Write a structure and sequence with these properties.
The structure is cut from a larger assembly and holds chains A (468 residues) and B (86 residues). Chain A has 14 helices and 11 strands. By secondary structure, chain A is an alpha/beta fold. Chain A has a single domain, classed as Amidase signature (AS) enzymes, CATH 3.90.1300.10. Chain B is mostly helical. Chain B starts with a helix and ends in a 5-residue tail after the last strand. Chain B has 3 helices and 2 strands; from the N terminus they run H-H-H-E-E. Classes of the chains: A alpha/beta (468), B mainly alpha (86). Chains A and B meet through helix 8, helix 9, helix 10, helix 11 and helix 12 of A and helix 1 and helix 2 of B. The structure holds zinc ion (ZN). Chain A binds one RNA strand of 71 nucleotides through helix 11. Chain B: It comes from Thermus thermophilus (strain ATCC 27634 / DSM 579 / HB8). Chain B: This is Glutamyl-tRNA(Gln) amidotransferase subunit C.
Chain lengths: 468, 86
RNA sequence: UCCGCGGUAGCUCAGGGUAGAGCAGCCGGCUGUUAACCGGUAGGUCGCAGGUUCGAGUCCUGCCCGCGGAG
């Protein structure tokens, strides 16, 4: 629907200003109940919507996760520490969309600092799943997903560190791409695990993902970890193998809910009638990756969130002392954050560094290896984004029980491998997602292979309650 | 294998002051989590990859205007960031 | 320096209500033992100095010593 809008705009049938007014209204009427947006781009939207040339993304408006810097707009990262913070600079990704006519609708709700899998850890309020108001939209990009599924926005930006983009996309029945680590800039991302973080696109159609990526991705002189690889995404004008080899991961086959297994089998039939060589492969140490993640990520998180004392920009907790202020200000963290940064400090702490961090590092290198070997025999890998559909609020608030949500998605980050969650059917009224991932740098492969599926099937995309 | 003393030590290193209620709570969580993680198998690691990093040229880039910088500060005084004394 | 296990007969180690067992020692028995064994018996700064308890080897505060482990 995104590319459809830009079409109507370029032909003079509609003006960008019209599109904004339309979406702004819908938000003001639906968001109250949904709770998808934290902040909204004030008068600076209507004003900005009436000065645009018919640029590639002119008529388009984007919903950005609130841990991504937007100059002049409140970027809280879903935390109390930053509930009044307003960046004097703009995230490279966001900056690029803006230069192509795009505009920010508002800022999306997330789990505090991106650490969460249900949005139930937002310092402000939870977000509701448009398909079922009694169930979570996933996390931590729960807001962005929820916004898309309710057509509160044509495009959306999220953040992925352990599946924070895929898991929500699955729960809300939309597309979520985690870019190969280095494709999209991290400059402007209030990130928590530097080695694993990546800004990811999400949309209601694969052609739309192409729009975002083509605009957002690319080398940034400010990010020393960015790759010099031209996007070239919108060349999804398919000359697609036929005949790619697809490998299904055994380890992720057992433990899935009826609707996931069902959606999985059906997808295979589809890829076969498409000309793919489907074969079962082995991801030996994949099941043990969840552990390595919750020792590598928390480690980097402790050091990344260390900067948040009340000195230069956060909230001040008003201690009236020297260290007592820093100590009191950081107490404003949420239960989940505290938990993680305490773990992170332990894993790096003296006497435990090699015993844990050093251990998890060596294991992280195994996965990359086992993956290199797998892509010597297959061209794509398939598994569920999650073993089940969205769960109901309150259901899974146990430290470990929450961590296992990211069981299938953690691997993509530890390896850097691009991965895409796509609506692969339902089980009842709740959407179900499948995760399709490729070797490094071949992000466009994933996209075209999903265009094939999105087409071979009419559409497994339901718009819970959507309209222009 | 996690004593209340370590928690204190950790919360010290992380400069995070939690309530005695949270301490008892987090004490149970951390235990379970550190057990889950400890299940991680040990593995051999190979050569530390090839170095392909890049360097930035020594060319000046415009700075923030003092006004915009201090606007983030909870407390400022005569062009300085103001914090409680040491 | 920190951390984790240790310190009990001589030697090597068992364990909130006489502190115990086999090795050797002592007494008694046995003509083929290979680390002989059978009975009886003797053997103590439970690490040291302070607490809780009616009662502490056992629990809890500090220190000495040994081994091991950390970028
Ligand atoms: Zn500078």
């Amino acid at each position: 629907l995104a590319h459809e809008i830009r079409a109507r705009v370029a032909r003079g049938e509609v003006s960008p200003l019209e599109v904004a007014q339309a979406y702004l209204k819908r938000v003001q009427e639906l968001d109250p109940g949904l709770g998808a947006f934290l902040s909204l781009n004030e008068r600076l939207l209507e004003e900005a919507e009436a000065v645009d040339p018919g640029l590639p993304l002119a008529g388009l408006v984007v919903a950005v996760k609130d841990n991504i810097a937007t100059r002049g707009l409140r970027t809280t990262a879903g935390s109390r520490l930053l509930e009044n913070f307003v960046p004097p600079y703009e995230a490279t990704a966001v900056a690029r969309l803006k230069a192509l006519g795009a505009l920010v609708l508002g800022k999306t709700n997330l789990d505090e600092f991106g650490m969460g899998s249900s949005t139930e850890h937002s310092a402000f309020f939870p977000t509701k799943n448009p398909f079922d108001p009694d169930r979570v939209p996933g996390g931590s990009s729960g807001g962005s997903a929820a916004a898309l599924a309710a057509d509160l926005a044509p495009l959306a930006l999220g953040s992925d560190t352990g599946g924070s983009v895929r898991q929500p996309a699955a729960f809300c029945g939309v597309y979520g791409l985690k870019p190969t680590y280095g494709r999209v800039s991290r400059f402007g991302l209030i990130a928590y695990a530097s080695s694993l973080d990546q800004i990811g696109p999400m949309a209601r159609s694969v052609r739309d993902l192409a729009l975002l990526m083509d605009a957002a991705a690319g080398p940034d002189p400010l990010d020393a970890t960015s790759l010099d690889l031209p996007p070239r995404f919108q060349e999804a004008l398919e000359g697609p193998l036929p005949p790619l080899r697809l490998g299904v991961v055994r380890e992720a086959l057992a433990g899935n809910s009826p609707g996931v297994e069902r959606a999985l089998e059906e997808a295979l039939k589809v890829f076969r009638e498409l000309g793919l060589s489907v074969r079962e492969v082995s991801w030996p140490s994949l099941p043990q990756a969840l552990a390595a993640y919750y020792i590598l990520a928390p480690a980097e998180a402790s050091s990344n969130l260390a900067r948040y004392d009340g000195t230069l920009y956060g909230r001040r907790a008003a201690g009236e002392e020297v260290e007592g202020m820093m100590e009191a200000t950081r107490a404003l963290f949420g239960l989940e954050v505290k938990r993680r940064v305490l773990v992170g400090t332990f894993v790096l702490s003296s006497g435990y560094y090699e015993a844990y961090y050093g251990r998890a590092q060596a294991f992280r290198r195994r996965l990359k290896a086992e993956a290199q070997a797998l892509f010597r025999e297959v061209d794509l890998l398939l598994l569920p984004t999650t073993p089940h559909p969205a769960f109901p609020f309150g259901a899974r608030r146990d430290p470990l029980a929450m961590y296992r949500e990211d069981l299938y998605t953690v691997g993509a980050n530890l390896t850097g491998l691009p991965a895409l969650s796509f609506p692969a059917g339902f089980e009842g009224h709740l959407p179900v997602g499948l995760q399709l991932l490729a070797p490094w740098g071949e992000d466009e492969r994933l996209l075209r292979a999903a265009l094939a599926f999105e087409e071979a099937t009419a559409r497994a995309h339901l718009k819970a309650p959507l309209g222009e | 294998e996690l004593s209340p003393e370590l928690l204190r030590k950790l919360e010290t290193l992380a400069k995070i002051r939690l309530s005695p209620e949270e301490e008892a709570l987090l004490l149970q969580d951390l235990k379970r989590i550190l057990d889950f993680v400890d299940a991680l198998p040990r593995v051999e690691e190979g050569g530390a990859e090839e170095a392909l990093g890049r360097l930035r040229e020594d060319e000046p880039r415009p700075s923030l205007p003092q006004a915009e910088a201090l606007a983030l500060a909870p407390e400022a005084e005569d062009g300085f960031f103001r914090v409680p004394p040491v």
